[PDB]
Each structure stands twice: as C-alpha cells, then as structure tokens.
Homo-oligomer: 292 residues x 4
C-alpha cells in the first residue's frame, strides 16, 4: 500500500519505444508472485521524462488493468508546473490507483514557500493520497523537513519518498509529522539503514529484478530483524550500486531483458543503449545476487 | 546576433498569469532603444517551465511580431525528451527567429553520449542555428567540454550558454572548437570574467533592467577594455547577485514592475510573490545600479 | 572505556591561555558525578591545534592525575607527520591512559595507502589501543570504510571516531570489521541516529555541558530505548547545533563558563572570543536544554 | 620577486628522508638558469608537513646559501597556532629571505575574524613581506575576499597565493586591494586563466620540472600575449593535472628523479612511493610536455 518493498517499475518498450503490454503483464505477474507490496507506475524509473501525459496515463491505466486488483498501484504525477501537476493528477481521479507520487518541481528551483503552495494546490484538487518525492540530484531543489512538516498537515498528504541518501532526514521528518505519515527510501543502497532508523519501506529500482529478495528484506526490517535483512542487503548491494552505472533505467532495463522479464531493453532518447562495459558490470552484480 | 548583451527576457503576465502584450511591447521597445544585441524568448527567465508548448510558441511569435525586425529573437526550445525538443523546434521553422537555445535534458540525467545524441538529432532536423545550454544547478547534469567539442562539429551547432559559473570552462571549450563557435555566459555575476577569458557575450537576467549598461559593458569587454567594463560591472554586481535572492524570475519581474517596464509582477506557480525582505534587497540593488 | 558518552573535554585556560588546574579538576569531578563513560584529553575540542606537544602531554598527565582512577582517559595523539604521531604516542606509553585517539593526517592529504601506513606504524610503536578518527571537513582527507577494514586487522586498532555526519558509514564499516570493533560518533547532531544504526557511543562536545543528559541518552540507546533517548536528543539538539555557531570550542567554552564549570572562557589564537550574537545563541540553546 | 613563475620547490631527500644538499643545489642551479622568478622554500610541495621547525629552518638556510644571491627565496612559515607562526617567522628575521608564505590555520577552522587576528599578529612581529595563502581543500577553511581586503591594509601584507581554483576570486580580491597587492595562482591547472583575469604570477608545482616554459608562459601572460602563453599552457596541461594523480609531492618528486634533477624520489610518511600506474601517467605527461 505505502509500506514494504514498492517497485519503481520500468515501462517496458518494444523496439519502436512504445509500451510493450506482454512484457508489462509479465512484470506485474512477477511482482504479484514475488510479494512486492505495490507498484509505482510511470515514476522516475518508468521514464516519466520521455512519455507525454497521454502516453503516461495509458501506461498507468494499463498497469492498473493488468494488476487486476492483485497489487496496489501508485501513479507518478510529478510536473514542474503546478497546473500541469493538477491536470495529470486529475486524470487518475476515480481510476483505481491508491495514491500519487509527486516530485518537487525540477529546473525552476522553487522556494520552500513555492513547494508548499505547489503540493497544497495539488492535494486540494484530488481525493487521492499524495506521496511527496525529494530527489535534489535530479531536480535542483531540496524539500526540507520543516516544509515536509507543514505539508503533512494537509489531510491527503500522507508520506514521502526521500531520495537524498542523507539518512539524517528520517528522524528530522519523523519528529515533525504524525506517526502514520509514511517514510519511504528513494535510495536502494541506503534503504535498509533508512528503515533501521524508522523508515517504513522503499520505492525501489533494485526490486525490478530482485523482487522476492527485496520483499523479504523489508519484511525482516519491519520485524526488527536487521541482521538477517543485512545478509540479503549485502547480496544485493552490488546491484543497488551498479543499476546506476549508467543513467537509470538503462541498467535495470538491460537486467530485466537478461532475466527474460521483458522482451526488449529499448529506451527513449536521451537514454541510450547500455554500453558493453555496463553490461558486464550489471551481469556481475546479478551473479553476485544469485539471479544469474 | 549571438555576441554582446543578449537579454533573457521575462514573460510579463497579467494577474491571471497570461502574457501581457502591452508590457512585452514596452520591454521590446526598451531593448531596441538600449542597444541589446538580441532577445531570448521563453528561456529560463521567461518561465519556459510553466508555459505549455502552445503558449510558449505564442509568446515567441508575439515577440517576433513586436520586434518587427528591429532586434533578433532566439527561441528557447529545450526539452528533456529528444522527440519533444525536435517537435518544439519544428514550430519555429521559418518563423523569423535567428536561432534556438536548447538546454541539456533535465531530471533524467543522461550520459555524455546521450547528450551528444540528443543535441545531434535536434540539429539534424532543422536549419536553425542551435545554442547549447549547460546549467547543472537546474538540470542535474553537466555537458562537459569534450562533448561540446564533439557537438561543435555539427554545422548547425554554433555556440553555448555556459551557466555553471565555472570559469575554467571557457578555455577548455575554446580549445576544442573553432574560432567562430560562440561562447556565452549564463551567469551574470561572473559574466565579465567569462568575457575577459575569451567569451563573446552573455545571456543575461540583469539586462532586463540595466540594458544600456549591460550593452556598453559587453562592447567594452569585446574591445578588450576590461577596466572600463569592470567599473560598470561593479555598479551592477549587487543586481547580478540579488536578482537571485529569491528564485528567478521572481526578483527581476518585481524590479521590472518597480521601474514601470511591466504592468504586473505576476508569475505562475510554483513561483510565488516576492517577500518584503526580497523587495528591500532588490530595491537597494536597483539603487546601487543607479536605476531608481 | 570505548562505549557510551565520551566527553571531548575542553582544556580550560586562565586569562594567559595556560591550563587552569582548578577548572580542569571541577570538570573531571563533574564527569565522574554525571556518569560520563570516559574523557578524551587534548583532542579537537581540547585545542590540540594550539598546544605544543609538551603542553599537550602536561594536560593529559594532569587530567589522568585528577581523574585518580575514577574515569578512563583517552589521549589525543594525532599528528600529520607519522614520526610526530609516534613520538607523541610514545609519551603516553605506560602512563595510565587507556587508549589513543589518532586523526587522519591533515593538510598533506595522504592516499588510502598513506593512511594505512601511517596508522599501522603508529600502532606498531605502542601497546595502547588506538581509536581512528575521520573528520574530512577539518583535514582534507577521508578515511574510507575499506581502509578502516584493513586497519582493523591490526591487533591494537580497535575503533573509530567517525565525524563525517554521513550515517551510511556505520554499516559500511561494521560489515568489514569484527564485532568488537568500536564505532563512535564524532557528530553530536547525528549521534543518536549513528547509535540506532549500530554505533556504540559518541565522542561528544555537547557532553561538556550536558554530561548527565548525554550519559542517559547513550544508556537508553544502548538498551534499545530509542524513543526515550530521542526525547533527550530533542531537548539537546539546539546545543548539538549551536555549539558550532562559532568555531569549536569557542561556544562550548563560553557555555562552561556560564554554567560555572570553568573560571574563564579564554582560548588561544586563532580562536577568538565569542561574539555577542554567539553568546545569545548559545544561551538560548542552554535554556532549551534546561541547563539555565 | 613576487610576480612571474615562482617554484614551489621540492625538498629532495636521500633514502633516509633527510635533505639531499647535492640535489637541492642541482635544482637551484636549474631554476637560476631557467628564469624562475623566485623559490618558495618548505612550502606545501616542500613537505612542510613532515619537517619539524628546525629541519624546516635548515632547509631554508641551505636554500639561501645555495642560491647565493642569484634568485630570491620566500620561506614557507605557516602554522595553525598563531604563537607558533610568529615563532617560526622569527627564525628567518634577517636571514636573507625576501618574504614569507603563510597559510590559513588548518584543522581548527577559524572564523574570518580569527584569520584576521592570526595574520595581523604575524605581520606585526616582523618586517618581512607576507604572502597570505588560501587552500581550503587542505585546511578546512576559506579566507574570503572581504578579509583579504582588511588584511591588505597591513603595510607588511603584500599578496596572496590563491589556491581554490575558483577564478571569480581574482577580481573580488583585486577590487578590494591596492594596485600593488600581488595576486598569485596556487593552482597550476587554472593559473594561466588566473593571470588572464589580472593575476601577477603563479606559485607553481609544474615549474619544478618545466621551469623555462613556465617562465616564458608567465612573461607572455604579463605582457598580455595570452594566445602565445596558452600554446605553452596546452603542452603543460597534462602535467598540471597529473602532478596531482597521487598526493603532492609524490608525482613531482618522481618526475624530478626521472629527469635526473634529484638523486632519489624519497618522501616522508604519510607520503608513500608512487604506484606503477602513477609512473606511467606522469611519464606520459612529461612526454607531452616535451621533457622526456
Ligand atoms: Cl519512482
Ligand atoms: Cl535563457
Ligand atoms: Cl576529540
Ligand atoms: Cl607553496
Ligand atoms: K496528512
Ligand atoms: K558548428
Ligand atoms: K583490531
Ligand atoms: K599592504
């Protein structure tokens, strides 16, 4: 729902760069079988950047259909113009998605006041639960804990994807928000740490190819079995890192193809095909995880 | 014109956030009279982020119409999806613009190879001159001199707006490109330095309100009269800094409103109104520049 | 010993800038009464930088005497020349100190191999237990986990003071070292987090003025009572931050004087007296902690 | 001489790590013949870090003796304790050195006010010219232009070695100081740029092995012949970079040994011998410079 291992799912494409429905179906069955808690549809790893809003919606709706109620679906709804964020969100109103993942505006570098006004207006135009998303390395913008606390007072703003990799944020935010506000890691390599500090789960790239291990790792973590969870983490750590050897989702799409989870590893420009060195790097990491 | 003082022009809005033609006319007249070399239309300072492509196109066409041939117009054409950059570029084919200013894809953090393919594909599908645009603080990625060198070999790719503020970039780029490739500062505070090291001009925010001083400073710099230019630069430096006291273009729109150049300082969310503290800072900088 | 709240104790000085024995005695009695686990003598907060090695040794020996076996004493032994680090360490051989805190060489920015050779030679010239100390913001040098793992294989290298504030180091180092290798925070503001991740204690500036709260906080943490510990942490957090409002130990020495723990707040150049604004800032933080 | 090419000279050692007089003589003769403007003795590249003050003094006196009046000598006199900087400075009173190069206190991270008091006290207690030295990557602190301006009003404080590599500093400083205050690069890779913006010379590592080319480059720069200088700079750029492939002065000592300028490339710990990979990198850079 908004806890445990949530997959930031690739948008599998055919060689023309359009969504491949057979491959998407395969992935969703895989996550259902693997115990993945929920799917984020057309977020960062889903190539929101290169899909238009029509194409984006189509993929979300298709993911919802294919999930067929077996697994919750969260739509990516980020936009750097507030009007566009509202319009995108409105597409999914009364759709069946259980919530939205909405990133700080990118490029235009708003103030903390701008962020507040952005997310508040968005939340006001929907009944859907909103998960905030902070990823300064991609946006040029850093949603600080104090502002998270402001926004957590809005009824349908109910969690955050914290992708800074700065573990001090977990308790800075937690102390400012209510106990049911959800704290999700957006950084695979630090996600178990994030959970040990009081985080509730992760929105994961790694889970695309190691869904069963990730679900188990998060379950152990939630049970306070951190040492057991670390064993899994150590097995996956090469993948947490090397899935970013080239820009995400170049590595993870290749990985999915190699594992036979998708038909092709095709991306849209300006993402380009994985290099030979990248292939070998990712293959090694998959081997280390025992997936190959 | 791709040398000298080039204004990164505001998109003046009425209170509803729609383009104010009368204000835009006033600004264009001001720049024609003040010796500005060219206008960048719907660039960063022009709120490209919050105008849709159709609104974007309208503002460029209006700017051309109002310019009435008296000052060259460069269109902002950046997009983080290569297909979308190409598509936007096509709207301006035979429009009368003299070239395009195209930013590195934002948010998705492409590799240098991806940047190369991005910009190459765009240049391929137009006859218009292309000015590359590097601004890592906004985008999350950094177009490096090596790649600029590769791209400069494309007939159509004629220069760069270098907005890092990292002055070593000037001669790293210059040595990799031909003598006609144009090097333009995208950082007002370091732009005179940038010119002194070999740069050809500036795509300027400060020029929105200090057009004549900017024009003279850039001509003096082009003539090698750096001490003379620097005296002007010193009176402008508070403005170069404090126009970013709050996110651009909030301070510069307020300044234009205060001088009577535009009718309102309205922006679109996630930009919010200037704070009182911001007004005082900006006002003092206007006064140091001799503008109030 | 090497667990719980370890104070990075100020070197209290008279108005001439020499160690004040009465004030030192008062502090040591205070830490004995407060339940502080151990004292680091002439570390960072002890002004190792401005004491010569004779003066440094004198303070260590005086601290040892005054402690009179009631509380363990760790000597600061850092030097950026390996020969000097050995010579300093040798002063304390068979002294009564229970171990040494030895920082990465500062200024000369050694390789990971240089760090390895530095700490290994030092450890080879003593039977004293060695605590490594990483504080890149002061040294220009970052001792990475992998190198920590190398050095942990040396018999008398038994722990690390990790002052990066980067919480990911806790588990990166822990997985590479044996279960009795000690992990101590060197960053008050993140120290409870550091302990929640598996750290064993903190070498603390805050403990100079809030020794009882710090000892209790670390005890709760060690017992797994993290929520109770956080309550104390929140009470101290203003102090964790504001004790660095001006360069350490300017704030904490003023604080000690204000609390009547020391006779004067005198420092050696280039440390200078606390500013009026700094006073008011620290006073507020002490009030928030309920110490004033 | 405080303009032109100033060499940051190595302290050549025998295998025991003691100063090699015969090697030092050879280096000084080389610099006299090659047109170097002056020698910095026991600066950063001279292993000030690992020589004690008495060894430090000996090397300066030997350098003066060997120079025999044929080239000016500046002594490195930095210390992180103000009393110790003054004390070291006194050793060189009436020695024959032409001035001192004094770094911002390292490790203890003083305030700007502390820097001001530090440098003011030092200048006060000598008649020797003082050159301030800013290198935040080594020290943990940053002497800002405002404070440089304050200090430049001291009769005795005559210039700065600016080693940030941040080229905006040149004119920020220049506008705050008199026209006779000397601005010297401390970053070989950006030194020609630094000179082109108004700098007067460079305190150079590269000059240890490319003395004549460095001398000519700096004279051309001083005459405003930047294109001519830049051609030399381009052949030297691999060296400007790869002399820092491993910590300075490891690469430059190896290079001096390879050219036969010094008898051994021995250093003192925590500096360690060059790696094989480092040798190959440095050798290629020597060959690109035409030196092998
Ligand atoms: Cl996502
Ligand atoms: Cl622009
Ligand atoms: Cl300490
Ligand atoms: Cl030097
Ligand atoms: K809420
Ligand atoms: K071209
Ligand atoms: K050990
Ligand atoms: K002076």
């Amino acid at each position: 729902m908004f806890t445990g291992s949530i997959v930031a799912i690739v948008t599998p494409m055919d060689e023309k760069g359009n969504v491949c429905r057979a491959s998407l179906k395969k992935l969703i069955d895989y996550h259902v079988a693997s115990g993945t808690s929920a799917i984020v549809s057309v977020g960062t790893t889903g190539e929101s950047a290169t899909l238009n809003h029509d194409e984006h919606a189509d993929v979300v709706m298709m993911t919802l259909d294919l999930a067929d109620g077996r697994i919750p679906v969260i739509a990516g709804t980020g936009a750097n113009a507030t009007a566009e964020a509202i319009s995108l969100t409105q597409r999914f109103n009364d759709s069946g998605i259980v919530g939205c993942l909405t990133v700080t505006p990118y490029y235009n570098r708003p103030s903390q006041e701008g962020l507040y006004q952005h997310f508040k207006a968005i939340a006001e135009h929907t009944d859907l639960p909103q998960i905030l998303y902070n990823v300064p390395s991609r946006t040029g913008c850093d949603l600080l804990p104090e502002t998270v606390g402001r926004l957590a007072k809005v009824k349908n703003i109910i969690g955050i994807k914290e992708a800074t990799g700065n573990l001090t944020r977990v308790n800075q935010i937690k102390e400012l928000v209510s106990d049911d506000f959800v704290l999700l890691s957006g950084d695979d390599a630090s996600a178990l740490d994030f959970m040990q500090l009081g985080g509730h789960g992760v929105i994961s790239v790694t889970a695309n190819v190691a869904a069963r291990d990730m679900a188990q790792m998060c379950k152990l973590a939630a049970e306070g079995h951190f040492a057991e969870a670390r064993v899994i983490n150590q097995r996956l750590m090469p993948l947490h890192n090397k899935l970013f050897v080239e820009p995400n989702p170049i590595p993870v799409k290749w990985a999915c193809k190699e594992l036979g989870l998708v038909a092709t590893d095709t991306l849209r420009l300006p993402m380009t095909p994985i290099t030979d060195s990248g292939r070998e790097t990712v293959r090694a990491a998959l081997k280390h995880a025992g997936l190959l």
